Amino acid sequence: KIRTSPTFRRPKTLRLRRQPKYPRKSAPRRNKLDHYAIIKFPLTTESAMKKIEDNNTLVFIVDVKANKHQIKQAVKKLYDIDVAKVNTLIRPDGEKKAYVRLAPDYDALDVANKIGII
Amino acid sequence: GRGAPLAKVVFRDPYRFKKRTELFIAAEGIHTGQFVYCGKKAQLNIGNVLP
Amino acid sequence: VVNPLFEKRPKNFGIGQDIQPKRDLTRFVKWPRYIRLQRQRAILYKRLKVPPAINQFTQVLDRQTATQLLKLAHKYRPETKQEKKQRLLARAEKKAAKRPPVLRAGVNTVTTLVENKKAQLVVIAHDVDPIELVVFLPALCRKMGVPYCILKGKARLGRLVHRKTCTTVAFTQVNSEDKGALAKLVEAIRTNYNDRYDEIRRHWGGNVLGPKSVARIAKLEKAKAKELATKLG
Amino acid sequence: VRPKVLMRLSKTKKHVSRAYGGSMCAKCVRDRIKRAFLIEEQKIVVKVLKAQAQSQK
RNA sequence: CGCCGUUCCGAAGGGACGGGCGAUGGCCUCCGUUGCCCUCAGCCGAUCGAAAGGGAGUCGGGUUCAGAUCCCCGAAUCCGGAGUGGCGGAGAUGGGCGCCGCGAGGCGUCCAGUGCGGUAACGCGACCGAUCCCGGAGAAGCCGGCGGGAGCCCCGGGGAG
RNA sequence: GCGGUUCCGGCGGCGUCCGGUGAGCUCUCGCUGGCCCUUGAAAAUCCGGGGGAGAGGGUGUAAAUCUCGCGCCGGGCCGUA
RNA sequence: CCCGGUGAGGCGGGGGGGCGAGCCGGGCUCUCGCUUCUGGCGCCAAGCGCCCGGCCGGCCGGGCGCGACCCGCUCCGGGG
Ligand SMILES: [Mg+2]
Ligand SMILES: [Mg+2]
Ligand SMILES: [Mg+2]
Ligand SMILES: [Mg+2]
Ligand SMILES: [Mg+2]
């Protein structure tokens, strides 16, 4: 009715949400970073053996794109174990190494036997 | 870079609940806590702004 | 009975004093460029000198005439797309088992009719833009002796023909029961337009200063007249 | 303390139990109370004289 | 190809306490979420720009061939979240009148209660509150003198080698 | 000083004590001064205050609310020789 | 067409009101628009008038107007 401000601003108009006639992609893209992709293979060096026996820690080579949360969930589902924490580094050769510590109720040495590490 | 000092003067906004800070050239003899007056009907005193 | 706690608390809106109220600033708003443009174009058409050929379109029928003219024209509207289908289907049934009068619309159709003297009354919108589309029509109708009128709104002529807009429409024939109504309009319309054509085409428009300027001129002159009156006292 | 440490301190540690407390000094709170009171009295004094002068006029 | 320009020739807000109309659900009691309308709304310039500037919060011990304030042991701490965010404590729990009782107190009504201490500086464990507004911190050079605390050095003794 | 597989955070005894001093050196905290026709960043971010629109319960099974004490969950990404 | 200012916030004209002047109480010459003591405070309307809704004249709650004069064609100035 009246303008108590000297400024004209663009009035807010309705903005509809998209309702595509067709989907631009026929099917959703498959997940290329599933659990089998995230865990490549276990490390079996002298350091990795020390980690298993003394720190309750498995040592894995993992996809460089995987994060700690993804590593943790893959390890749990692949081997049905429980994970206390995960430490990661990227090696000078470009691979990502995961230091997965098991919960105190799991024995890494026992788990390593199931996986075939030892 | 400027020889003259500058005075920081605070006015009330006549249309909004605010304080307006201006930056004047400091006329010689003005002091902090002094009242200055600007407008057609301000009195002829050092530091006032008049037409 | 009044509660003694209530009281008046007036605000003093002098310079200084209390913050000013929220009054209407409409006059002082900074409008979008497109709003400033169309308003400044309205002012220019007042401020400049408008030639008679363009200024003639500011003279328009009064609402009373424009209502009678539009009620008569409502009886001869072109058939809509829908009801042309029914007429065609009815002819199909009739074939298995005359053109009535209608409005003629479009500046190209009306122009040919005026030149052929086949039009009886020409209605021209006052706000066609570009104006060159019809700027010549009032003078053409006068030359051919076709009564013409100027109506407010190309949208109103648009509604007659079931379209958004129409620059002009024309009566070519009417039913016998409406011949008197057309004659009454033509006589009134002819006096306002065709018989004043000499003064319409010599009558410039615009050339009016802004109110502040006019007021300034009025104040300046009034000083002299008062002094001139006080010259003799 | 550093400004982002104030977020984890209780309110009591960041102010004083007094009007403007924690933001204005005590000395200048006493002055503003007198100044506000004393100035508002002068408005009544000046208003009364104006009313009286108008009454005589 | 592009260039100038960075607030300057711009309808530059996609937000919100609250209110009213509906729609959906759930620990369906009533609350969320959600759509519209009303109301309110300066920031005034996208963005980038510092591994020495600003910027919350981690320390001691042990451990390897090579890593550690990152691993292990121990002891902490910041930020964010949870209203199915749980338990304490605070708000909080008082007084008048009328009955009963020797009293301790118990009942019925009527009123109060968004904490308290100090003359003060200010203190106490919290100690409601939005738009809006004011202010503080971040946030301030170089040089001199002097003083306090540390580490180191020095001096006099006890041990142990 | 004792043991072991003897490549065990192995196990034991004792000790880890009492004073002085300084324009000393280094760091730091603070007070006070001098110099400038030199006056020596900004922002993210955090806080307090002013106001009082509101909300909370009717004396209890108390409410709104709480920057108080506990308790519950999490902290991804890249660098690191 | 150009320049300056501003969050384009009260511009022009008229009305209304106040102090003065002066002609024989009224009309006008003509001016003014409510802040100057103090290193306070100042928004998000009080009041009034008129309508309306819900519940049981009484409660609870809304809308409009005045307050905050009206009409206007360039935001206001400076150039041109
Ligand atoms: Mg950046
Ligand atoms: Mg940095
Ligand atoms: Mg840690
Ligand atoms: Mg308060
Ligand atoms: Mg290193």
UniProtKB/Swiss-Prot annotation, chain A:
BP GO annotations: translation
Positions of modified residues (Phosphoserine): 5
Superkingdom field: Eukaryota
Keywords, sorted A to Z: Acetylation, Citrullination, Cytoplasm, Isopeptide bond, Methylation, Nucleus, Phosphoprotein, Ribonucleoprotein, Ribosomal protein, RNA-binding, rRNA-binding, Ubl conjugation
GO cellular component, one term: cytosolic ribosome
Annotated compartments: Cytoplasm; Nucleus
Biased segments, Basic residues type: 1-29
Residues where Phosphothreonine is found: 7
Residues the record lists as N6-acetyllysine modifications: 32
Citrulline carried by residues: 3
UniProt PTM: N-terminus is methylated by METTL11A/NTM1. Citrullinated by PADI4.
Region (Beta-like import receptor binding (BIB) domain): 1-36
An MF annotation (GO) of this entry: rRNA binding
Predominant location category: cytoplasm
Family in the record: Belongs to the universal ribosomal protein uL23 family.
Purpose: Component of the large ribosomal subunit. The ribosome is a large ribonucleoprotein complex responsible for the synthesis of proteins in the cell. Binds a specific region on the 26S rRNA. May promote p53/TP53 degradation possibly through the stimulation of MDM2-mediated TP53 polyubiquitination.
Record's subunit section: Component of the large ribosomal subunit. Interacts with LYAR and GNL2. Interacts with MDM2; this interaction may promote MDM2-mediated p53/TP53 polyubiquitination. Directly interacts (via BIB domain) with IPO5, IPO7, KPNB1 and TNPO1; these interactions are involved in RPL23A nuclear import for the assembly of ribosomal subunits. Interacts with IPO8.
Domain comment, as recorded: The N-terminal beta-like import receptor binding (BIB) domain mediates interaction with IPO5, IPO7, KPNB1 and TNPO1.
Protein name listed in UniProt: Large ribosomal subunit protein uL23
Originating species: Oryctolagus cuniculus
Name of the coding gene: RPL23A
Curated annotation (Swiss-Prot), chain B:
Post-translational modification as stated in the protein's UniProt record: The modification is impaired by hypoxia.
Compartments in which it is found: Cytoplasm
Highest rank taxon of the organism: Eukaryota
Quaternary structure and partners: Component of the large ribosomal subunit. Interacts with CRY1.
Function summary: Component of the large ribosomal subunit. The ribosome is a large ribonucleoprotein complex responsible for the synthesis of proteins in the cell.
Family affiliation: Belongs to the universal ribosomal protein uL2 family.
Name the record gives this protein: Large ribosomal subunit protein uL2
Organism the protein comes from: Oryctolagus cuniculus
Span of the entire protein shown here: 53 to 103 of 257
Curated annotation (Swiss-Prot), chain C:
Cross-linked sites for Glycyl lysine isopeptide (Lys-Gly) (interchain with G-Cter in SUMO2): 22, 71, 212
Molecular functions per Gene Ontology: RNA binding
GO CC terms in record: cytoplasm; ribonucleoprotein complex; ribosome
Residues annotated as transmembrane: none
Domain of life: Eukaryota
N6-acetyllysine found at: 8, 71, 184
Signal peptide positions (record): none
Chief place of localization: cytoplasm
Keywords: Acetylation, Cytoplasm, Isopeptide bond, Ribonucleoprotein, Ribosomal protein, Ubl conjugation
Subcellular location field: Cytoplasm
Assembly description: Component of the large ribosomal subunit. Interacts with CRY1. Interacts with DICER1, AGO2, TARBP2, MOV10 and EIF6; they form a large RNA-induced silencing complex (RISC).
Record function comment: Component of the large ribosomal subunit. The ribosome is a large ribonucleoprotein complex responsible for the synthesis of proteins in the cell.
Family that this chain belongs to: Belongs to the eukaryotic ribosomal protein eL8 family.
Name of the protein described by the UniProt record: Large ribosomal subunit protein eL8
Organism (species): Oryctolagus cuniculus (Rabbit)
Range covered out of full length: 80 to 319 of 319
Swiss-Prot record, chain D:
Localization annotation: Cytoplasm, Cytosol; Cytoplasm; Endoplasmic reticulum
Cross-link (Glycyl lysine isopeptide (Lys-Gly) (interchain with G-Cter in SUMO2)): 50
Family classification: Belongs to the eukaryotic ribosomal protein eL34 family.
Subunit details: Component of the large ribosomal subunit.
Functional summary from the UniProt entry: Component of the large ribosomal subunit. The ribosome is a large ribonucleoprotein complex responsible for the synthesis of proteins in the cell.
Designated name of the protein: Large ribosomal subunit protein eL34
Source species: Oryctolagus cuniculus
Residues of the full protein shown: 59 to 115 of 117
